[PDB]
Each structure stands twice: as structure tokens, then as C-alpha cells.
């Protein structure tokens, strides 16, 4: 359709001037047809354009891949979401963390895990020691606190269950099964020329730094085509291997609610159609930064939509999809813009189409 380009230009393009963003890639998939819109530069200093080879950091959108990896492991019988991490990380047995189940970790309800590890935690030993000393605060399962260490520990345990380091689970099993050609935990030499610079608030060129359990929490890099294939698989998984179909399905099941937000595995779920403010509320300070007491799902929505924002210091991402409309959108920038702007522009676009 000849209006998709026009709508993306009206709603996403103004954001480059407004936030002084060097480079953007916006993708729409509708009725199994992909549209790729590219703006500006992957590297300011090299005068290099954004294109279908441009590799961006996904930030917390990496969590969706962690969730899928976990779904895949559940369905090959390598793990159960009622398990505890001590069953795979031997050294955590019988510590208080070994009362938390894998689901509770993946969905941020351990009752005492913060957004980030302390700056001081860096090596594997410091990570191990962090979880050994862990003690509860809220009743386990009762409180959602959005957390890198929580899902990161899930990710490490999933990898353990598959006897392979986490980067190899994604690069050798999960990415290939999704048909992705250029998605990485570690960007190889051969593709470094395609890796965008990110840009901080002082417009300095930056890329993500090493950190503890970074890969499963925020550590994947991808292109617009690949992310459009990931959305397709989410929208239309029948074409994909059975294994990966079951994984995908697992990531769509809502597990509990926080007001109008349903927490699935990695993805955030809403009743469709969702009001704009519903979508904005999921990225509110109250939801992202503060603990919130969860409830069981009462209303099981009949028609669902799903989203997830992601950031690193130099990059913004947003991904959204609506199965009932066979439509989805992906936005990638090499500078952060406010989450509310990403959400609102996608809302206007996806409603305008149908
Ligand atoms: B995620 O939800 O995108 C997550 N990102 C990270 O923790 C990785 C980063 C390190 C430094 C800056 S981001 C995250 C993102 C945000 C946000 O609004 O950008 C807030 C909390 C966690």
C-alpha cells in the first residue's frame, strides 16, 4: 500500500529533527508484506547511510529473544518453569534464591531484585556471590519489579539446561531457527563495518559496554530485515519449525496483570484495541521504576496485542504486533528518544492502516 511510506514519514520522520537523531530504520509488516523505511546515517563521522545491512543495538528488546530461548528449552523438556535455578546452577542450591522459580525470575517477581546489578558487580565470581547472599523482601511472586539481574539469571539457567553458553544458544540454535541472517550477541569482524555507532545526549559516538549477564538482558544486535522476520514469526508462526513455534507460543501466554498490562514471557500484552494511554502506562515511571503488586489475570482478552521498548546508552528500539490484524512495526534509532514518542508514532501508523 502506497500510504505506508507516507504515514511513516508523517509520524516517525519529524522525530529525527526533534531529538537530533542521526539515523532511523522503521519497518512495517502487513498481510505478509514487508516495508522498510530508512532515514539518515548509521555513522555521522563516516557519512554512512542507514540501510538494510545496518546493525543496531536492541537493548531490552533482547529480552524477547531470552524469553523465546526459554520457551524452546521448556518444549524440548530441558527445563520446567516450576524448576529453581539451583537445579542447574549447582552452586546456588539451598540458598534463599533457590526458592524462586524460573517463571518468577523471567517475569520479575522474586520480591527483591533491582533494575540493575550494583556497579561493583562485573566478573562471574561477583555475579555468583551476588545470588548466594540474596535474601527475600516481598512475598515471592507477589511483587513485580522490572529487573536485568532477574531475567539475566533466567537466561544463564536456560543456557545451562542446553549445555552451551548463552551466546551460542542464540547464535547457533535460536537465531538460525528464526531464519535470521545478521542478528548477534557478538558482532563478528566481518560485520563491524555494518555496526552503527550509537550517539549519547552529547551526540558522542558510543557502543554498548560489557557488563554482568548483559547478553540475556540487553545484549543482542540486529538489522531491520531480521527484526521484521522476528515479527513475522510472532504474527504467523505456522511456517516455522515446530520447536520454535512452541517457543513463540509460550512467549505469548500472559502470566499475571498489573492494571491494564499483562506480563507475558518477555513481551508485554494488552487487550486489543488498546487506548494510547494504556500503551504509554506500560512505560510509566510507576511500572518501570517502582515495585507493583501483581494480580491474577481476571479478564482473559479475546484479541491481544504485544509490545516491548528497548534502550542502551546510544540506541532506541520499539517493536509491536497485533495477530488479529496481521500487522506489526519495528523502530530502530541510533540515539535514544522518549519511549512515549516511539509508542505514540506506532499507534498513529498502525491505526491509520486498519
Ligand atoms: B531496557 O528496558 O531497554 C533497559 N536497558 C538497559 O538496562 C540497558 C541500559 C544501560 C544504560 C542505559 S539503558 C532499560 C531501559 C530504560 C529506558 O527507559 O531507556 C529504563 C530501564 C531499563
Amino acid at each position: 500500500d502506497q500510504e505506508i511510506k507516507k504515514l511513516v514519514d508523517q509520524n516517525f520522520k519529524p522525530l529525527l529533527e526533534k531529538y537530533d537523531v542521526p539515523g532511523m530504520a522503521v519497518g512495517v509488516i502487513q498481510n505478509n508484506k514487508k516495508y522498510e523505511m530508512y532515514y539518515g546515517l548509521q555513522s555521522v563521522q563516516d557519512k554512512k547511510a542507514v540501510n538494510s545491512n545496518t546493525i543496531f543495538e536492541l537493548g531490552s528488546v533482547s529480552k524477547l529473544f531470552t524469553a523465546t530461548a526459554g520457551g524452546y528449552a521448556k518444549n524440548k523438556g530441558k527445563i520446567s518453569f516450576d524448576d529453581t535455578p539451583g537445579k542447574y546452577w549447582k552452586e546456588l542450591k539451598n540458598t534463599p534464591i533457590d526458592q524462586v522459580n524460573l517463571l518468577q525470575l523471567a517475569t520479575y517477581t522474586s520480591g527483591n531484585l533491582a533494575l540493575q546489578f550494583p556497579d561493583e558487580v562485573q566478573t562471574d565470581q561477583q555475579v555468583l556471590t551476588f545470588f548466594k547472599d540474596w535474601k527475600p523482601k516481598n512475598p515471592i511472586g507477589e511483587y513485580r519489579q522490572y529487573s536485568n539481574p532477574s531475567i539475566g539469571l533466567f537466561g544463564k539457567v536456560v543456557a545451562l539446561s542446553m549445555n552451551k553458553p548463552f551466546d551460542q544458544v542464540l547464535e547457533k540454535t535460536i537465531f538460525p531457527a528464526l531464519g535470521l541472517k545478521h542478528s548477534y550477541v557478538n558482532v563478528p569482524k566481518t560485520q563491524m563495518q555494518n555496526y552503527a555507532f550509537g550517539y549519547n545526549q552529547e551526540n558522542q559516538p558510543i557502543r554498548v559496554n560489557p557488563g554482568p549477564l548483559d547478553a540475556p538482558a540487553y545484549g543482542v544486535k540486529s538489522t531491520l530485515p531480521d527484526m521484521l522476520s522476528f515479527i513475522h514469526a510472532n504474527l504467523n508462526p505456522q511456517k516455522y519449525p515446530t520447536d520454535i513455534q512452541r517457543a513463540i507460543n509460550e512467549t505469548h501466554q500472559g502470566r499475571y496483570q498489573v492494571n491494564t498490562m499483562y506480563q507475558a514471557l518477555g513481551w508485554e500484552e494488552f487487550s486489543y484495541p488498546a487506548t494510547l494511554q494504556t500503551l504509554l502506562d506500560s512505560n510509566s515511571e510507576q511500572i518501570v521504576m517502582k515495585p507493583n503488586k501483581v494480580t491474577a489475570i481476571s479478564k482473559e482478552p479475546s484479541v491481544k496485542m504485544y509490545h516491548k521498548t528497548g534502550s542502551t546508552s546510544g540506541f532506541g528500539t520499539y517493536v509491536v504486533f497485533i495477530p488479529k490484524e496481521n500487522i506489526g512495526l519495528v523502530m530502530l534509532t541510533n540515539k535514544r528518544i522518549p519511549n512515549e514518542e516511539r509508542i505514540k508514532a506506532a499507534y498513529v501508523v498502525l491505526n491509520a492502516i486498519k
Side-chain angles (χ1 to χ4, degrees), residues 1-2 4-5 7-46 48-89 91-134 136 138-163 165-188 190-237 240-252 254-323 325-353:
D1 177 59
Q2 213 180 301
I4 294 161
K5 189 266 200 212
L7 293 163
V8 173
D9 282 351
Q10 291 176 322
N11 299 279
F12 285 81
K13 196 184 178 200
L15 297 169
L16 283 77
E17 289 212 331
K18 198 176 175 187
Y19 300 90
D20 187 27
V21 182
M24 192 177 65
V26 178
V28 175
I29 179 164
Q30 177 197 31
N31 296 323
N32 312 108
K33 173 78 172 301
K34 287 165 184 165
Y35 304 79
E36 302 171 23
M37 321 291 115
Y38 301 111
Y39 302 96
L41 301 175
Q42 92 184 38
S43 171
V44 169
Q45 73 191 250
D46 301 302
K48 181 158 181 163
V50 180
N51 70 76
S52 63
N53 303 298
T54 302
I55 298 177
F56 292 80
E57 299 171 0
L58 309 192
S60 302
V61 168
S62 312
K63 293 170 176 73
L64 305 181
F65 287 108
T66 306
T68 306
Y72 177 101
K74 183 183 160 279
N75 285 282
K76 297 209 164 290
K78 306 293 196 192
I79 62 174
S80 161
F81 294 165
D82 297 283
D83 292 357
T84 62
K87 181 172 168 157
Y88 308 92
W89 208 351
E91 298 89 338
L92 294 174
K93 269 144 89 76
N94 319 133
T95 80
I97 196 98
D98 201 35
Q99 306 300 109
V100 181
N101 71 44
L102 301 195
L103 187 65
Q104 285 161 341
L105 283 181
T107 69
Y108 317 121
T109 69
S110 73
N112 198 46
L113 287 165
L115 186 76
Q116 302 294 352
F117 287 98
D119 290 313
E120 295 59 39
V121 175
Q122 294 295 326
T123 54
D124 299 315
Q125 264 303 143
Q126 297 169 324
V127 167
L128 185 35
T129 302
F130 180 82
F131 289 124
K132 287 187 190 182
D133 305 2
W134 188 88
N138 298 152
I140 301 191
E142 273 213 359
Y143 282 81
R144 184 189 184 274
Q145 182 100 65
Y146 187 54
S147 168
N148 287 334
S150 193
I151 196 164
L153 177 57
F154 175 77
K156 174 89 178 102
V157 169
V158 172
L160 284 170
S161 83
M162 288 167 79
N163 200 23
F166 185 83
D167 71 294
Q168 291 297 278
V169 171
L170 296 188
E171 295 180 0
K172 301 290 159 130
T173 304
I174 305 303
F175 298 156
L178 297 161
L180 310 184
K181 289 128 68 139
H182 305 295
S183 297
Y184 301 102
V185 173
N186 304 295
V187 182
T190 158
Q191 289 281 336
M192 276 300 286
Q193 87 256 44
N194 297 323
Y195 187 169
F197 287 117
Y199 291 89
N200 60 16
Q201 290 314 302
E202 300 74 34
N203 282 64
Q204 298 163 312
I206 56 165
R207 286 192 182 115
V208 65
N209 286 311
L213 292 186
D214 57 3
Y218 58 85
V220 178
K221 298 91 198 199
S222 205
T223 67
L224 189 76
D226 274 6
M227 294 304 295
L228 279 171
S229 303
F230 182 56
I231 296 310
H232 182 259
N234 275 274
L235 281 171
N236 262 224
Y240 290 80
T242 302
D243 290 330
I244 212 81
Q245 291 188 61
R246 284 156 174 177
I248 299 165
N249 179 260
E250 201 66 59
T251 76
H252 302 170
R255 304 291 175 167
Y256 64 71
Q257 42 193 159
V258 184
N259 313 124
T260 50
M261 175 168 94
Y262 300 78
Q263 179 69 59
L265 219 59
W267 296 100
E268 297 169 4
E269 177 199 323
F270 312 85
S271 172
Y272 183 78
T275 65
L276 173 58
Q277 190 66 50
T278 292
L279 296 175
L280 295 170
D281 271 354
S282 54
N283 278 238
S284 69
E285 183 184 37
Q286 187 48 62
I287 297 301
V288 177
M289 307 299 280
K290 308 181 165 167
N292 295 265
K293 181 159 237 121
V294 311
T295 61
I297 294 173
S298 164
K299 302 187 267 162
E300 189 68 271
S302 84
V303 192
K304 290 104 136 181
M305 66 175 291
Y306 297 85
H307 85 192
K308 187 65 182 96
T309 53
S311 292
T312 63
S313 293
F315 288 85
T317 307
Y318 184 61
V319 162
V320 51
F321 76 90
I322 310 146
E325 304 280 347
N326 203 24
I327 206 173
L329 178 151
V330 182
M331 185 211 79
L332 308 168
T333 52
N334 66 345
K335 174 177 200 199
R336 298 172 67 160
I337 63 164
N339 288 311
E340 57 276 26
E341 296 273 43
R342 313 168 195 191
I343 297 169
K344 178 168 65 175
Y347 183 81
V348 178
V349 172
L350 295 181
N351 291 332
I353 298 148

